[PDB]
Amino acid sequence: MRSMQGKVICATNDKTVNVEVVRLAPHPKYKRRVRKKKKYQAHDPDNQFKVGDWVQLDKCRPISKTKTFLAVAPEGRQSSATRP
Amino acid sequence: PTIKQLIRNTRQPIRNVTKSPALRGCPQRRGTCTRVYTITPKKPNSALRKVARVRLTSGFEITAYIPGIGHNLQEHSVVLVRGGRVKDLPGVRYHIVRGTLDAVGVKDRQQGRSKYGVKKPK
Amino acid sequence: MVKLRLKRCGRKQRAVYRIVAIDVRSRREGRDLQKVGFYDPIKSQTYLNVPAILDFLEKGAQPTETVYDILKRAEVFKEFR
Amino acid sequence: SRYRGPRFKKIRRLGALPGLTNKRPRAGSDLRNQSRSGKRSQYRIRLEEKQKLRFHYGITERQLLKYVRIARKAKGSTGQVLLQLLEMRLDNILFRLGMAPTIPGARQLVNHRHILVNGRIVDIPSYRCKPQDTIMARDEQKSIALIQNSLDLSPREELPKHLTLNPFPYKGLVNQIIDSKWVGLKINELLVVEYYSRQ
Amino acid sequence: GFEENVVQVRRVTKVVKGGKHMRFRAIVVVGDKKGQVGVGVGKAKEVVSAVQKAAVDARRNIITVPMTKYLTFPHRNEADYGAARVMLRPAAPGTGVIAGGAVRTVLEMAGVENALGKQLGSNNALNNARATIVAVQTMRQFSDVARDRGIPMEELWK
Amino acid sequence: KDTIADIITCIRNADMNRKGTVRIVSTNITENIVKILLREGFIENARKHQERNKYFLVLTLRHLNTFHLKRVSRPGLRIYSNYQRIPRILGGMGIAILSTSRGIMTDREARLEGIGGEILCYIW
RNA sequence: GGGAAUUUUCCGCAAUGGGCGAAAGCCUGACGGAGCAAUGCCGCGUGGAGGCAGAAGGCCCACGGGUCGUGAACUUCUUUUCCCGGAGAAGAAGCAAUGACGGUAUCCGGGGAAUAAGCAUCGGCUAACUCUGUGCCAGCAGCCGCGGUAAGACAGAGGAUGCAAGCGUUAUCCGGAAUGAUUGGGCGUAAAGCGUCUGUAGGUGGCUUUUUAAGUCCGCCGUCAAAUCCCAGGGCUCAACCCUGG
Ligand SMILES: [Mg+2]
Ligand SMILES: [Mg+2]
Ligand SMILES: [Mg+2]
Ligand SMILES: [Mg+2]
Ligand SMILES: [Mg+2]
Ligand SMILES: [Mg+2]
Ligand SMILES: [Mg+2]
Ligand SMILES: [Mg+2]
Ligand SMILES: [Mg+2]
Ligand SMILES: [Mg+2]
Ligand SMILES: [Mg+2]
Ligand SMILES: [Mg+2]
Ligand SMILES: [Mg+2]
Ligand SMILES: [Mg+2]
Ligand SMILES: [Mg+2]
Ligand SMILES: [Mg+2]
Ligand SMILES: [Mg+2]
Ligand SMILES: [Mg+2]
Ligand SMILES: [Mg+2]
Ligand SMILES: [Mg+2]
């Protein structure tokens, strides 16, 4: 709700991981919810993330040019592996 | 059509077809006349209608119409042009103002006196 | 610096002011953040809500010459200190 | 900003206007011209209904069209609310009381500072008088004579319920808001609204 | 027995050998101002006889219009008649009758004094006027809904 | 594809041909929709059966008016509404079937309940 | 100078606000005022009442008359406005004094209808008509189109209509225009289905029971300045306009 989730594609760089964020919002003229995409750059000093993982972002003071976020784990998920 | 096609901006408006490009949006515009003459109108009508080839200060060479009865204009005269087109004369899309820099009011005219720049009798 | 002065808004040759707290370097018709009174010389009427005015004066707001006189006729200074 | 012209010239063609003058036309001039006119268009019928308001009250289209906006803003019976604004005009109230023989004659009395309202002079014929408002003349014998001459030199028409008269001051008083059926002119208000539908 | 008004008059031609037979086409609308609306078309060589035929053809088909206590429509409704679509809605009291020429007369002669309408299709008075009749026949009062639905009128107002 | 888009039409086409039976499909959503038309007086009766494990429902239509119908919220364009913009079809002659968090109800029942939702189809 | 076209080489720091100074005070072409312009909006005038009968005059006529026309003349009444002569502020907050505007607004007295209406249109859309002159000529016109010897469409005259200190022309934007049709259009023949098929991205997606609550709905909090718009109330003689509250 507050922060933005995203997929962590292109995690090749050192101490950094490119992240793809997705959101839906209604079109102002026609009122249809369109899936828009926007990328960001975050940092994981432990390098605990790799491509294929699910990651959450947080605001922080700027680390470099265009890298102004911090990668954290997700809060609310629905794994629920094999519940009755 | 499909709403996905609408998001492609399939629809656009139509642009203006303004009928006085020479004025550049202004209501009137000054210009010197180059060659006064007459011309035969379209086939059904028949007359020798008066016109004037004008060089406006906005960078456009055009021709106008001489409304009214009688005129004193000649080459090297300064007139004042307005809009309005004459359908009977193809190509003419402007009128001059009577009662201005050099074009004088129509002689012996009482009705519709403001459209020709003529003093009221007293 | 914050200051308590009054701006003009009305008709020509009919002055109708309102008291307001705004920055000094801002112009006369500057962006307001709290309107704390109303005044005119002709009718001589005044609302002059006191709870808002004392909030600024505690924080270093300096009234002008006439606003000092307006507050002087009121008993706000005695309760201010 | 005023008619200043002949009135029978319009009364032959327009209709009846007790507000302008109680006099009547003389001649049904010619059967020829009636044959020339003949029928009428729907726009003309809506037009002629509007012109009756221009004479019975002495009002301009700009001054009238403003009142149309106030009626449209007012909820319910925009045609009725229009007459509520015209009948409450000071120029009509001083006339319907009988203090003048003609509404133009009453408009002159208001303009030359002869009437006061609630103890204050009013120099506006278009002044809207509210309910419970007193209307008195001035102390000069000239002012008192003009109203006194109007109430004495001819018979008096029956007044409405929303107007009174105290003959000791020769004054009046507005009681409440008018009803649309107490207008002093046979009107079809709906046609007027149909005329201003474009504007 | 009541009045009528001519909505339109138009000349139609013929291409006989010798020349052309210019005869008139009269459209007449009939209304008592208290329901009883009728639309008819007539045609004749003369103007007067064409109006008379249209009057009989209009009186040949008369229909009442549902109205409310304030002389308005119970509700909005649309209709189509060929390439002629006509729109109608109720209105507030004192609003007046406002609509196109062909639509004003048939409503003005009906009795409704406060309504509004617009025609979205062809400008033909005949095709537009008939569309109004198709629009009004398909409207009803609240009471007709209650009897055909088994619910009282007050319960529907909620 | 949208089931309810087909439900509104099978009832419409039956009135154009002027038939009594419909043989409409049964689902968790349609059983709530049909239940509103019974109480509201648009349909005389409903009845359930089966031929396979699947289920169906059989309606009973009434014998110059027409049973108008219209869908509003489509898969390609969903439409929601708040409380203040709940429609009022024809001043009350019609009704709107909309889904709230507490199931589906009539717009009038939503006016009292105080909760808007997803309008799905209007009726008049 | 350019351009169709947009202002006094003014008065004052009295008020408001700003800078310096302990203070007195200094500066302030910001600001407050005046002047020019019908540029726009609003408001009031350019007279009210009566005027029997008859006459001059303009236009028209079937030559009897009709219209301009209660209009005018005439008789009384009134003076916004106009002229003359006096009185005369608020705005100033601060004991008193401190006013650019300003002898300004405003009030009293005298005189006297005396100082004040024009512009467009009258073929259909579109409210409003005849006559003379002209003869596809001169000319009108937004569209359809009028005029070639009886022109309701040109010009003149009378009359009428619609506006009114404004009236019309031109230019620019929206509306009408559902004529880019989410609301609200269409593609057999009127403009519009790729020559056809397979399929990537993308869009949408059968039924049943649970999970979560992103979207969606409800209740509270903060915020989207003021002014403007909307409702109410009040103050300028009313209105425009100004102010208070929501
Ligand atoms: Mg670094
Ligand atoms: Mg005016
Ligand atoms: Mg249309
Ligand atoms: Mg589904
Ligand atoms: Mg100063
Ligand atoms: Mg100072
Ligand atoms: Mg200096
Ligand atoms: Mg001018
Ligand atoms: Mg007179
Ligand atoms: Mg006409
Ligand atoms: Mg002309
Ligand atoms: Mg002739
Ligand atoms: Mg002419
Ligand atoms: Mg459009
Ligand atoms: Mg569409
Ligand atoms: Mg089309
Ligand atoms: Mg073809
Ligand atoms: Mg084709
Ligand atoms: Mg495929
Ligand atoms: Mg605001």
UniProtKB/Swiss-Prot annotation, chain B:
<keyword id="KW-0687">Ribonucleoprotein</keyword>
<comment type="subunit">
    <text>Component of the chloroplast small ribosomal subunit (SSU). Mature 70S chloroplast ribosomes of higher plants consist of a small (30S) and a large (50S) subunit. The 30S small subunit contains 1 molecule of ribosomal RNA (16S rRNA) and 24 different proteins. The 50S large subunit contains 3 rRNA molecules (23S, 5S and 4.5S rRNA) and 33 different proteins.</text>
</comment>
<dbReference type="GO" id="GO:0003735">
    <property type="term" value="F:structural constituent of ribosome"/>
</dbReference>
<dbReference type="Pfam" id="PF00164">
    <property type="entry name" value="Ribosom_S12_S23"/>
</dbReference>
<dbReference type="GO" id="GO:0019843">
    <property type="term" value="F:rRNA binding"/>
</dbReference>
<dbReference type="GO" id="GO:0005840">
    <property type="term" value="C:ribosome"/>
</dbReference>
<keyword id="KW-0689">Ribosomal protein</keyword>
<comment type="similarity">
    <text>Belongs to the universal ribosomal protein uS12 family.</text>
</comment>
<dbReference type="InterPro" id="IPR005679">
    <property type="entry name" value="Ribosomal_uS12_bac"/>
</dbReference>
<keyword id="KW-0694">RNA-binding</keyword>
<dbReference type="GO" id="GO:0015935">
    <property type="term" value="C:small ribosomal subunit"/>
</dbReference>
<keyword id="KW-0934">Plastid</keyword>
UniProtKB/Swiss-Prot annotation, chain D:
<dbReference type="InterPro" id="IPR002942">
    <property type="entry name" value="S4_RNA-bd"/>
</dbReference>
<dbReference type="GO" id="GO:0006412">
    <property type="term" value="P:translation"/>
</dbReference>
<comment type="function">
    <text>Component of the chloroplast ribosome (chloro-ribosome), a dedicated translation machinery responsible for the synthesis of chloroplast genome-encoded proteins, including proteins of the transcription and translation machinery and components of the photosynthetic apparatus.</text>
</comment>
<keyword id="KW-0689">Ribosomal protein</keyword>
<dbReference type="GO" id="GO:0015935">
    <property type="term" value="C:small ribosomal subunit"/>
</dbReference>
<comment type="subunit">
    <text>Component of the chloroplast small ribosomal subunit (SSU). Mature 70S chloroplast ribosomes of higher plants consist of a small (30S) and a large (50S) subunit. The 30S small subunit contains 1 molecule of ribosomal RNA (16S rRNA) and 24 different proteins. The 50S large subunit contains 3 rRNA molecules (23S, 5S and 4.5S rRNA) and 33 different proteins.</text>
</comment>
<dbReference type="GO" id="GO:0042274">
    <property type="term" value="P:ribosomal small subunit biogenesis"/>
</dbReference>
<dbReference type="Pfam" id="PF00163">
    <property type="entry name" value="Ribosomal_S4"/>
</dbReference>
<dbReference type="InterPro" id="IPR036986">
    <property type="entry name" value="S4_RNA-bd_sf"/>
</dbReference>
<dbReference type="InterPro" id="IPR022801">
    <property type="entry name" value="Ribosomal_uS4"/>
</dbReference>
<dbReference type="InterPro" id="IPR001912">
    <property type="entry name" value="Ribosomal_uS4_N"/>
</dbReference>
<dbReference type="Pfam" id="PF01479">
    <property type="entry name" value="S4"/>
</dbReference>
Curated annotation (Swiss-Prot), chain E:
<comment type="subunit">
    <text>Component of the chloroplast small ribosomal subunit (SSU). Mature 70S chloroplast ribosomes of higher plants consist of a small (30S) and a large (50S) subunit. The 30S small subunit contains 1 molecule of ribosomal RNA (16S rRNA) and 24 different proteins. The 50S large subunit contains 3 rRNA molecules (23S, 5S and 4.5S rRNA) and 33 different proteins. uS5c binds directly to 16S ribosomal RNA.</text>
</comment>
<comment type="similarity">
    <text>Belongs to the universal ribosomal protein uS5 family.</text>
</comment>
<dbReference type="GO" id="GO:0003735">
    <property type="term" value="F:structural constituent of ribosome"/>
</dbReference>
<dbReference type="GO" id="GO:0046677">
    <property type="term" value="P:response to antibiotic"/>
</dbReference>
<feature type="domain" description="S5 DRBM">
    <location>
        <begin position="2"/>
        <end position="65"/>
    </location>
</feature>
<keyword id="KW-0150">Chloroplast</keyword>
<keyword id="KW-0046">Antibiotic resistance</keyword>
<protein>
    <recommendedName>
        <fullName>Small ribosomal subunit protein uS5c</fullName>
    </recommendedName>
</protein>
<dbReference type="GO" id="GO:0005763">
    <property type="term" value="C:mitochondrial small ribosomal subunit"/>
</dbReference>
<dbReference type="GO" id="GO:0019843">
    <property type="term" value="F:rRNA binding"/>
</dbReference>
<keyword id="KW-0699">rRNA-binding</keyword>
<keyword id="KW-0689">Ribosomal protein</keyword>
UniProtKB/Swiss-Prot annotation, chain F:
<protein>
    <recommendedName>
        <fullName>Small ribosomal subunit protein uS8c</fullName>
    </recommendedName>
</protein>
<dbReference type="GO" id="GO:0003735">
    <property type="term" value="F:structural constituent of ribosome"/>
</dbReference>
<comment type="function">
    <text>Component of the chloroplast ribosome (chloro-ribosome), a dedicated translation machinery responsible for the synthesis of chloroplast genome-encoded proteins, including proteins of the transcription and translation machinery and components of the photosynthetic apparatus.</text>
</comment>
<keyword id="KW-0699">rRNA-binding</keyword>
<dbReference type="GO" id="GO:0009507">
    <property type="term" value="C:chloroplast"/>
</dbReference>
<keyword id="KW-0150">Chloroplast</keyword>
<comment type="subunit">
    <text>Component of the chloroplast small ribosomal subunit (SSU). Mature 70S chloroplast ribosomes of higher plants consist of a small (30S) and a large (50S) subunit. The 30S small subunit contains 1 molecule of ribosomal RNA (16S rRNA) and 24 different proteins. The 50S large subunit contains 3 rRNA molecules (23S, 5S and 4.5S rRNA) and 33 different proteins.</text>
</comment>
<keyword id="KW-0689">Ribosomal protein</keyword>
<keyword id="KW-0694">RNA-binding</keyword>
<dbReference type="InterPro" id="IPR000630">
    <property type="entry name" value="Ribosomal_uS8"/>
</dbReference>
<dbReference type="GO" id="GO:0006412">
    <property type="term" value="P:translation"/>
</dbReference>
<dbReference type="GO" id="GO:0005840">
    <property type="term" value="C:ribosome"/>
</dbReference>
